Ligand binder design. Structure first.
Ligand code: NIO
Length: 319
């Protein structure tokens, strides 16, 4: 009977159909002439609202779509006011091209490739906890982000502000729904996507969060560095173990692609303590590893929910 989410499983069915039927959504498209598109945001531009000189972000959409446009707008409107969710301010079209764009609150991002090098133990806990606030909220709202990765987590370290951005791959969760496994970005794809298992849920985002946690406390970014989707499962199983992978597959009646038979090899399950060395020892703790172990596990249904992760001792200093 496949699997279902342990939490927020039925919350979309309990809501008005208009909430999740994004194909029926009809956005109110404003005039993009209200916006002065000043610079590329270091197809997203920094812009100034001509009316009130307030700075914003404008993201230009792809006009030929329709379906993914209605889906991203609807999810963003549903998530408005959500904790650490990037705030959609307006939906507009260029008056000449009719091309849709989205207007977002401005956030001064610090490139994660520099930021992560000066984060302390406290910082990582702090920001992971902020990120969890966002994920618990969108999952409570019946939405999987499906593309959690450092590039989609904007952080202003001066102001200690975090925002989960780019909801273009987000979907509504409905129990027993089969989804596209070509979602997320390679390094952060959960094992369920890599073995063509389509009945996944919110716990896909928790695997990606776990990937981020691992790279921050261990200083190996990305942590699972696949060269393609096939090799990505290989990198994971070099850590979580190959016999452990087969167990997972056995449990959910998943048959592994015959291509894997020649490249998977045989690998033992590594203890997380094996990734500790002098260069990350000040970021790692037993509480960090015990949390990580409960996120990066094959069995999506057994992974901690965002809410459970928030209750973990690792965030005791930031609650
Ligand atoms: O894609 C987005 O949602 C996005 C990108 C940059 C800034 N604000 C939002």
């Amino acid at each position: 009977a496949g699997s279902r989410a342990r939490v927020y499983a039925e919350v979309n069915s309990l809501r008005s159909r208009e909430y999740w039927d994004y194909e029926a959504h009809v956005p109110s498209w404003g005039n993009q002439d209200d916006y002065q598109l000043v610079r590329k945001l270091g197809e997203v531009f920094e812009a100034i609202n001509i009316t009130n000189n307030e700075r914003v972000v404008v993201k230009i959409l792809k006009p030929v779509k329709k379906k993914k446009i209605k889906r991203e707008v609807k999810i963003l409107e549903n998530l408005r006011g959500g904790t650490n969710i990037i705030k959609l301010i307006d939906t507009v079209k260029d008056p000449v091209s009719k091309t849709p764009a989205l207007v977002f609150e401005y956030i001064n991002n610090t490139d994660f490739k520099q930021l992560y090098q000066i984060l302390t133990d406290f910082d990582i806990r702090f920001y992971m906890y902020e990120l969890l606030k966002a994920l618990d909220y969108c999952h409570s709202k019946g939405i999987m982000h499906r593309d959690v990765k450092p590039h989609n987590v904007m952080i202003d370290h001066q102001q200690k502000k975090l925002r989960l951005i780019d909801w273009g791959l987000a979907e509504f969760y409905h129990p027993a729904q089969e989804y596209n496994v070509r979602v997320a970005s390679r390094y952060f794809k959960g094992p369920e996507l890599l073995v063509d298992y389509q009945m996944y849920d919110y716990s896909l985002d928790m695997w990606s969060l776990g990937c981020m946690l691992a790279s921050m406390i261990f200083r190996r970014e990305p942590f699972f560095h696949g060269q393609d989707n096939y090799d990505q499962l290989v990198r994971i199983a070099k850590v979580l173990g190959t016999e452990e992978l087969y167990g997972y597959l056995k449990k959910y009646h998943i048959d592994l692609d015959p291509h894997f038979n020649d490249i998977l090899g045989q690998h033992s399950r590594k203890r997380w303590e094996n990734f500790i060395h002098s260069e990350n020892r000040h970021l790692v703790s037993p509480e960090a590893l015990d949390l990580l172990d409960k996120l990066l596990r094959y069995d999506h249904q057994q992974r901690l929910t965002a809410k459970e992760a928030m209750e973990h001792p690792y965030f005791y200093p930031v609650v």
